[PDB]
Amino acid sequence: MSKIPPALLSEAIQNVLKDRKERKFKESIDLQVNLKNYDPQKDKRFSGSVRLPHVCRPRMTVCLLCDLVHEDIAKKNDVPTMNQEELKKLNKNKKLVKKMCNQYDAFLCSESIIKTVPRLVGPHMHRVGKFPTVCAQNESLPDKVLELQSTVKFQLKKVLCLGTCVGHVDMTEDQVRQNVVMAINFLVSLLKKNWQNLKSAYIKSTMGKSQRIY
Amino acid sequence: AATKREAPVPRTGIIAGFNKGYKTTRRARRPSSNDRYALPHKKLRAVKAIISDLVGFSPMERRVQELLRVGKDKRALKFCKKRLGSIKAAKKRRAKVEEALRQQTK
Amino acid sequence: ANNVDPIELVLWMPTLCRANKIPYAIVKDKARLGDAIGRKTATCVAFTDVNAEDQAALKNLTRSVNARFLARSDVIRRQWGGLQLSLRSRAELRKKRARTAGNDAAAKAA
Amino acid sequence: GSFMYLNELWKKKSSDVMRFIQRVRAWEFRHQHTIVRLRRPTRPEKARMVGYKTKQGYVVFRVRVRRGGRKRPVHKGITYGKPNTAGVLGRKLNKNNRVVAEQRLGKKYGNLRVLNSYWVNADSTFLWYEVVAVDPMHRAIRRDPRINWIVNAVHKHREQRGLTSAGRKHRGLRQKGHKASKLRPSRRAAWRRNNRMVFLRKR
RNA sequence: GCGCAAGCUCAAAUGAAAUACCACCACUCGGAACGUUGCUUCACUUAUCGAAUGAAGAGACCAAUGGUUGUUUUGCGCAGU
RNA sequence: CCAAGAGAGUAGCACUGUUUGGGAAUGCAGUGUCAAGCCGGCAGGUAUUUGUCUGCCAAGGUUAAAUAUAGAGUAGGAAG
RNA sequence: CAGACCUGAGUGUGGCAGGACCACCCGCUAAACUUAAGCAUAUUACUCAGCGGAGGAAAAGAAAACAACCGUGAUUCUCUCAGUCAGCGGCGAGCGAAGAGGGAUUCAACUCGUUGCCGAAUCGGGUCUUAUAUGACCUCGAACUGUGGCACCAUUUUUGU
């Protein structure tokens, strides 16, 4: 999918977007990828970070030891700080696991607790694709979260269909299509069977149906 | 086939260790016309195919074909190997049915 | 010819003809053929030529024959031959067996 | 050369179409007596290519031989013996059916020389081979200087000495040296050779 | 967050394990369509097979007919070349 | 102005047996099964795939001479 | 509208075959005794016996070999290797080879079927000529294809058409 043999207009996503209804409501466009055929107890699945230019993803949590530098300073500039104790409390209930993956795109963690952060929160962060990156006491927080913010997650499981959000209608038709293109370009460049087990891909608006890419 | 015969082999230059006995002076072999061996001597194909067409298929051929038609295509692993015998043959059948169908289909 | 000692000997031919997209007829008997050549029977036959004078009729025919043979051939390639029991058995399903009457003998009346 | 077609066509054994042909033949033989002269082969392609070339002296036979294998005949199927060659359907039968067939043709008359023979059919019962047999007496044939070799003293039979290629197959002839070996001087001769005795002139 | 509404949400909340914008890997039946092909009915009569005979009346005879046996000039329908 | 015309239920494979010094198979025979885009086919003594590379081109068809004679060989020598 | 053709009979007509012989051959087939201190595997033996069937010898024979070369070039046979570092094998008993080299012998090599082969089959049988072919003519074997030509070494591949 995504393309046409003489490369004129090229063609599927462009027809789907051009035909697509316009509306005043703020329609997300999400990508539905469908997997089929694999070598199950031979394969390690895909728990992968797909980076998508322009996805509406930027928000983020900073794990530090509790002292003035820079945990107190991060609270007064209104950054969520999660100390070692708080991080353990976050992890358990099924109410909270969904709002952590859904309401954060970047994770930052302190230098003086570097062994401890993999040991504790790593399984949740794995599927998310935005693993905690190092934060020093001299760190600039907005300058460190770069590609984590562009990340969207692929978690294969035995999933024959997961949905991801490739952008909104506020992101151009080139950005939503470039994100599905980029997504396939990451999937191909990350999955061992590339696109052999890629049955179908679709983009769908908030109040639009799903349209297949050929 | 002629993919195996052409200006071969300036063997070199001394015994053992990747080179051996004498820096050849590789005579002009092989004008070997038994490379006539079938090829697509057009005749072969032509006939074979007509008749091939004329006869339809075999039960099996069809059988495997079914498998394809579904896509049980590691199957026939067996059919081709056992039925035809040997791994090459297997390959050979495999093409053979498959092709015929695939283009047949258009 | 459709009457020949191995039919196998010639079997590929209509097909071939068809392949060569040439006019081909399914013609009866070896014997008469034999006779135009004066042999006891005769085996395969074609015209390359004649004289033009004779052509027109030939042409008419050729079309029909091919129409009856090549153009349809494929269809003929669908259409199987054979299957046939004795008479008796026809008569049977027509009769004592399957059509004595209303059926085999079932309901005629209503 | 039409045979080119013929041959391939002829390879199509395993099919319905053939099996028609086969079937008629399979009623025909099945109706029919054991060994018959033919006014032409039913498989000309092999025949001509195993050499049939249209004139007298060339004689055609169709021949019926029971297939299967065989028992070791023993009265009442009893062997005393040490174990080894045992079983009712024991020793399997070295000579080939074709060969027997030819040979039986060889026995069948007081003339014919198998030029060769090919299988035409087999059923559940009989193998049919169509046998190209020659008489070596026709004056034209005898006249024929191409074939006249056939006439000669070595030809007081052939088939039972194992002279067809097939016979020669069971007779084992392959020129592949280390798969040619032993039989190359017959079975026996070589044995005689190989187990020679101390003929040393001097010592 | 969603939408016409708005319900549930979300962002409550517990338990053993949690959902609207909702993309889905978790049984089971369910079908024709999906034409194929597998085992199966029971259809049949032509291979085979048993018997029988110097192969001595198979079928076409029954009601007012059959023959859907046809084959078939011929017709119409269709469809096609 | 190009052609370029080489062996099938055989080859093969299974299976069985038999057979071989020949070994994860030397053959053969039976039975079943059953091959060639021809970038082919056959061979290259550890099974295989897998790939090269190396040697040939089978499966129809004829062919002195140099050898034998081995017990029972026949014409005509030579002998111990 | 009408009588074949085709096949299978029966004659006539001309051959052939049998059985011999069978030392050696050529096929085929195919013991046990023995040994293993037993013995079944093994061995004997792929021998005996049996059977078929030839010759003056037969057999074999012209690459789907050998190789691993500085290469070889039908077969056969001999010598050789090697009773072996090939090896098989109650792995024991017992078994067990090839290649090459030297060498003898040899100037040994050969066809058809898939190639346009084709102005009444170029053929063959018969006939009749010619003193044989040839000539000739039928017969009618033969266009279900015999001839010729050509035969994956070539033809010059290929292109100098």
- Alpha carbons within 13 angstroms on the beta-carbon side of residue D8 total 19
Q: Is the CB of D90 under 7 A from strand G?
A: no
Contact C34, C4 (CB under 8 A): no
Please report how the helices B59-70 and B87-105 are oriented relative to each other, as an axis angle in degrees rounded to 10: 70
Please report how the helices D3-10 and B43-54 are oriented relative to each other, as an axis angle in degrees rounded to 10: 50
* Residue located via tokens 């046939």: C84
Spanning CA of D201 to C1' of F79, the rounded length in angstroms is 19
Give dist(CA C46, CA C1) in Å, integer: 11
Residue D133 token pair: 């047999």
Name the nearest CA neighbour of D142 among D26, D56, D31. Answer: D56
Name the nearest CA neighbour of A175 among A62, A23, A13, A58. Answer: A13
Using CB atoms within 10 A of its CB, is residue C85 exposed (0-12), middle (13-18) or buried (19+)? exposed
Using CB atoms within 10 A of its CB, is residue D134 exposed (0-12), middle (13-18) or buried (19+)? buried
- Return the SS3 of D163: coil
Contact A182, A42 (CB under 8 A): no
- Return the SS3 of A2: coil
Residue D80 token pair: 């005393």
Q: How many CB atoms within 10 Å of residue D111?
A: 13
Name the nearest CA neighbour of A205 among A16, A6, A11. Answer: A16
Contact A32, A201 (CB under 8 A): yes
Give dist(CA D10, CA D44) in Å, integer: 10
Contact D105, D131 (CB under 8 A): yes
C-alpha distance across the termini of chain C, in Å: 55
Spanning CA of B16 to C1' of G70, the rounded length in angstroms is 13
Q: Is the CB of C93 under 7 A from strand E?
A: yes
Q: Is the CB of C7 under 7 A from strand G?
A: no
Inter-chain Cβ pairs, chain B and chain C, closer than 8 A: 10
Contacts of C15 in chain B (CB under 8 A): 50-51, 53-54
Give dist(CA A198, CA A188) in Å, integer: 10
Where do the DSSP E strands lie in chain D?
35-38, 58-66, 113-122, 126-134
Non-local (6+) Cβ contacts of A14 within 8 A are: A177
Q: Is B43 in contact with D4 (Cβ distance < 8 A)?
A: yes
Partner residue facing B47 (CB), from D5, D12, D17: D5
| Torsion B42-B44-B45-B47 (CA) sign | positive
Technique used to solve these coordinates: cryo-EM
Residue C105 token pair: 């003998």
DSSP A42: G
* Phi-psi region at B8: left, alpha or beta (left = phi > 0; alpha = psi -120 to 50): beta
**Closest alpha carbon within chain C to B51:** C12
- Alpha carbons within 13 angstroms on the beta-carbon side of residue C88 total 1
Q: Cα dist. B7→B27, B33, B92, C24 in Å?
A: 9, 16, 31, 50
* Phi-psi region at A63: left, alpha or beta (left = phi > 0; alpha = psi -120 to 50): beta
Residue B35 token pair: 């490379």
Give dist(CA B53, CA B42) in Å, integer: 16
Give dist(CA B63, CA B57) in Å, integer: 10
Question: Which residues is D187 bridged to in the sheet?
Answer: none
Rounded CA Rg of chain A: 19
Question: Which residues is D114 bridged to in the sheet?
Answer: D133
Give dist(CA C34, CA C42) in Å, integer: 4
Name the nearest CA neighbour of B22 among B31, B9, B33. Answer: B9
Contacts of C16 in chain B (CB under 8 A): 50
Query: At residue C29, what are phi and psi to the nearest 5 degrees?
Result: 50, 140
* Residue located via tokens 């040979």: D103
DSSP secondary structure letters along C45-74: ---S---HHHHHHHHHHHHHHHHHTTTTHH
Q: How far is D99 from chain B (nearest CA, A)?
A: 27
Give dist(CA D156, CA A207) in Å, integer: 99
Q: Which bases along strand G come within 7 Å of a protein CB atom?
A: 4-8, 15-18, 25-33, 40-43, 46-47, 52-56, 58-71, 75-79, 96-99, 111-116, 121, 123-126, 141-147, 152-154
Give dist(CA A169, CA A27) in Å, integer: 6
Name the nearest CA neighbour of D122 among D8, D22, D16. Answer: D22
Pairing of strands A28-35, A198-205: antiparallel
Chain D residues with at least one Cβ partner in C under 8 Å = 2, 5-6, 9-10, 21, 40, 42, 44
Residue C106 token pair: 């079932």
Non-local (6+) Cβ contacts of A152 within 8 A are: A50, A51, A52, A55, A57, A129, A164, A165, A166, A179, A183
Residue D110 token pair: 């007081």
Spanning CA of D121 to C1' of E50, the rounded length in angstroms is 27
Question: Which residues is B100 bridged to in the sheet?
Answer: none
Give dist(CA C93, CA C100) in Å, integer: 8
Give dist(CA A29, CA A197) in Å, integer: 23
- Alpha-helical (H) ranges within chain A are 12-19, 73-76, 84-90, 94-103, 116-120, 122-128, 173-188
Which H helix or E strand runs over A203? strand A198-205
Give dist(CA D93, CA D111) in Å, integer: 27
Distance of CA B101 to the CA centre of its chain: 19
Residue B68 token pair: 């394809």
DSSP secondary structure letters along D46-98: HHHHTT--SSTTEEEEEEEEE-S--PPP-GGG---S-GGG-STT-S--SS-HH
Contact C19, D17 (CB under 8 A): no
Pairing of strands A198-205, A210-212: antiparallel
- Return the SS3 of A193: coil
Describe the strand order of the beta sheet including A210-212 as a list of residue ranges.
Answer: A162-168, A28-35, A198-205, A210-212
Chain C residues with at least one Cβ partner in D under 8 Å = 5-9, 11-12, 16
Amino acid occupying residue A132: P
Pairing of strands D113-122, D126-134: antiparallel
Q: How far is D46 from chain C (nearest CA, A)?
A: 13
Query: At residue A163, what are phi and psi to the nearest 5 degrees?
Result: -120, 145
Q: What angle do CA D80, D83, D85 make, to 5 degrees?
A: 90
Query: At residue D117, what are phi and psi to the nearest 5 degrees?
Result: -170, 145
Residue A31 token pair: 């990508």
Contacts of D44 in chain C (CB under 8 A): 6, 9
Q: How many CB atoms within 10 Å of residue A201?
A: 23
Non-local (6+) Cβ contacts of A172 within 8 A are: A54
Name the nearest CA neighbour of A181 among A147, A213, A135, A208. Answer: A213
DSSP secondary structure letters along chain B: -TTS-SS-----SSSSTTS-SS----------GGGGSSTT-THHHHHHHHHHHHT---HHHHHHHHHHHHT--STTHHIIIIIH-SHHHHHHHHHHHHHHHHHHH-
Residue D165 token pair: 């290629």
Give dist(CA C74, CA B58) in Å, integer: 19
Peptide bond before residue A11 is cis, with ω within 30 degrees of 0 = yes
Give dist(CA A101, CA A82) in Å, integer: 15
Pairing of strands D58-66, D113-122: unpaired
Resolution in units of Å = 5.6
Kindly state whether C12 is in contact with chain B, defined as any CB-CB distance less than 8 angstroms: yes
Q: What angle do CA A37, A43, A48 make, to 5 degrees?
A: 90
Non-local (6+) Cβ contacts of A66 within 8 A are: A81, A83
Residue C26 token pair: 């399914």
Q: How many CB atoms within 10 Å of residue D100?
A: 20
Name the nearest CA neighbour of D42 among D60, D16, D64, D68. Answer: D60
Query: At residue D181, what are phi and psi to the nearest 5 degrees?
Result: 20, -125
Name the nearest CA neighbour of D131 among D160, D101, D171, D107. Answer: D101
